[PDB]
Amino acid sequence: PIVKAKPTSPGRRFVEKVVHPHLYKGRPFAALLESKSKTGGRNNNGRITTRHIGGGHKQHYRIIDFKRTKDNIPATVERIEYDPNRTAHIALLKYADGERRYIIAAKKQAVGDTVMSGEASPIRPGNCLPLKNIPLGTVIHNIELKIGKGAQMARAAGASVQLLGRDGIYAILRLRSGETRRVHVNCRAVIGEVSNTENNLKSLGKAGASRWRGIRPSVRGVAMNPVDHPHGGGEGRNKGRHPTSPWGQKSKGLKTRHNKRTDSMIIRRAKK
Amino acid sequence: MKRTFQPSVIKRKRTHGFRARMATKKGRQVLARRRAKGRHRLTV
Amino acid sequence: NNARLYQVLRGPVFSEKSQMLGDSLGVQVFKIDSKATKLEVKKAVELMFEGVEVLKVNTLNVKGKTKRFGKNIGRRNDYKKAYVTLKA
RNA sequence: CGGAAGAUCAAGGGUUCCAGUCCAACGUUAAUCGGGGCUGGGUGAGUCGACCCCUAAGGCGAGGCCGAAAGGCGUAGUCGAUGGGAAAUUGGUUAAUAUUCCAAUACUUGUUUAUAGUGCGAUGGAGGGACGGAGAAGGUUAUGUCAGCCUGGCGUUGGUUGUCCAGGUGAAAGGAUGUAGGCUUACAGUUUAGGCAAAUCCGGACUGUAGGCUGAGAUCUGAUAGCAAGGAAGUGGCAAAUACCAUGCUUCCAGGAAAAGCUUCUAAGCGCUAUAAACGAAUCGUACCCUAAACCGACACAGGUGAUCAGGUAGAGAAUACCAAGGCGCUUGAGAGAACUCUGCUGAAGGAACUAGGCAAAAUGGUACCGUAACUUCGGGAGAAGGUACGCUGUUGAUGGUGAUAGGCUCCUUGAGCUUUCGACAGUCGCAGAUACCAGGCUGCUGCAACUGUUUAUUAAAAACACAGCACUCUGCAAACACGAAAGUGGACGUAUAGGGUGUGAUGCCUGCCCGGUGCUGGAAGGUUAAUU
């Protein structure tokens, strides 16, 4: 849940932290860990290609099983861990043969219960099934897009997908983006929504807390000079022009998708 | 106050040194030019 | 080979440190070839001074000094010297 | 001067180090002196560092991809420390080196030979190595101080053979030991959807059977060391680190290198473990400066320059004052004692009348206790404001620690000596007791920005930028977006509770009307309309 801090400092007055007593207090499983150095948002040219990235805490990469190809071998949930690489919690799975993996933890997934992968699996949270074997109207997460590639959609904390129906070899999914789209029925999904549903209820409180997460400050275009940004310039405060990015692309309403090879997968979008 | 030149031997030999010159085609042109002028110091 | 050991020792060192080292500990100081190892110094001493045994060789490289002569700035050669401890 | 202006380094420099000799130039003066000239000397390592083994960021990169050329990228790899990986300490010695030489006592790791036993072998598997921030209670040592002991002294002026004065005096690593702490069930057997193959090793599932590891310090040993006046002492109390136990323990969230060495397991394939004995451990660095006159600043330049060591008395203290060890008086002096300048000290009466403006100065300043308003987001405001005590002497109450001594690497009781913290009462001196140095001035109204932060290096620190928070909008993943000619990247080994762009800027109360213009989104009936034909 969400815990307010007492206003014992002005940097604490608006801290509302997400607290989970039930997640592991110890260190992650060492064999599923990879080193991961920060990038600063710089590509192989050493250029900033993504702004406001830098600093923050050193973190290891947890290797997540997004594919779930250990079918028909049951696993038990050893522990539910915090992951610094995502907003969702992760579950350490312990298979019958003793192999250990990490998966995205579902909300209704506790330590001790048994998870299954494959086509003859119960419709319980954490089980991975092909979309043709999941009853319509089941709330799912961790959606595969290409067959065998692993989950790409509905992975963030609290993420759920409505499985609306079917047309041929396609499952019709309503995503939390307000988007109805086709996915091949041989692609897999995991039952239930994703854990850490109150991720979006948190309040960082102070600028240093955003710095701890590797985010550098953001400087509005209107505060620049015209040589830096289309919004720069002016005696005093002034906008003057249609809002746009520093590269001159409009930022209020202009659509930017340009992908014809996937355009047939998309039923529709919602209007609000 | 702190001045512009803060010497470091490794940094000098790694940005301006002989092998650094010979690693580039443009550094080899630096060397060819220094040899054509007849400089007694090719590289730092 | 026995022709490389003849070039190892370039000559003795005559100084106050050398003199008192010889008096107190019976240790000989040589200017040695710039490329000689302790094993080579040991073998060369034991071959060119028949009847002596070498306990210890201590080596050191000494950088040559800059001595501006006339209009030019030049420098002396570096050299290597060995402290050789002999059986009493 | 002395948390350096002493000492040890790294970086950088390179002989400046030491001796002799010289004084033209150099040195802001002179110089017999010097970091100056000249001539000689000086740097000693299996253990310190480098090299070496290993990898981080990041490079380079057989093949590979891409690109007019040049080239760009990238796999395997190969490099790359600022990080991981073996090992010694005390004392003496030089004009100048010393964990290097010498003495004593250690430690690490190899090769060869031999004796036995005997399945060995990896770039691969598994363990290990191996790690965050904060906080807290202890236990210690370094070290200090007093005492004891030893050696000297009887004081130019009252006293000073004593409860007097001064100086000296405390051996390490290592080996044993296994303490205060810390962690912790152990062994055997059966088997196997796992560890890319294999595995007796790990993991998993079962069946029986029920103190160990680590660890500062103390103690013993090392230990008949060394050390002064001309051949001495060398052991007790107390205090006490930011060092050590401790890579520990407890908590938190922002979730905390890698790889090798090392221990085991097997694969292809065909040496290893103990006991010693002898022999070895290469190469490079080592002088000297290093809060500086030796580095970076054109200078022997008031600047800058990372780490380490950290004595005494006061003191919370690494502040401050005065001192120790050690090191210096800062390379022009001598007079005079005008104006004026600078930096200070004191100032009658008045007390902001000064001035753009209390600028500058003056003032306040410690601890304990009492007391403290509006307002408030209930945290605060607040050290609000404002008061009172405070030295020394004697007596006296309580109290923490440590433990001699007795009684039953341990326990309990008792408590000598030493030391901690609060008080009370009585006296006493001065103008003054937080006496020096040190060390908040404080209130009322009001604009701005929520706040901590950031910024015009070198005339602007702010009301500017950022900020947590809010909203709009884009983006379904080969995402949007950005770098790039492309390949290849970042976004992200992320996935709409996410990521980008834009505005606004905590919070409270809130956020009206206008879609004509220009954008954006959707629509396509009609008009117009390219190449082409």
Numbering used by the authors:
A (entry chain Cl): 2 to 273
B (entry chain Ba): 1 to 44
C (entry chain Sn): 2 to 89
What's in the article?
Here, by combining cryogenic electron microscopy, genetics and biochemistry, we identify Balon, a new hibernation factor in the cold-adapted bacterium Psychrobacter urativorans. We show that Balon is a distant homologue of the archaeo-eukaryotic translation factor aeRF1 and is found in 20% of representative bacteria. During cold shock or stationary phase, Balon occupies the ribosomal A site in both vacant and actively translating ribosomes in complex with EF-Tu, highlighting an unexpected role for EF-Tu in the cellular stress response. Unlike typical A-site substrates, Balon binds to ribosomes in an mRNA-independent manner, initiating a new mode of ribosome hibernation that can commence while ribosomes are still engaged in protein synthesis.
Our cryo-EM analysis revealed that the ribosomal A site was occupied by a previously uncharacterized protein. For the Balon-bound ribosomes, particle classification revealed that nearly two-thirds were also associated with the ribosome hibernation factor RaiA (state 1), whereas another third did not contain RaiA but were instead bound to mRNA and tRNA (state 2). By contrast, Balon lacks both the NIKS motif and the loop A and instead has a distinctive HP motif that directly binds to the decoding centre at residues A1492 in 16S rRNA helix h44, and A1913 in 23S rRNA helix H69 (E. coli rRNA numbering). This binding strategy allows Balon to stay 10 Å away from the mRNA channel, facilitating its unique ability to bind ribosomes independently of whether mRNA is present or not. In the absence of a P-site tRNA (state 1) the lasso loop is poorly ordered, but in the presence of a peptidyl-tRNA (state 2) it is stabilized by contact with the 3′-CCA end of the tRNA.
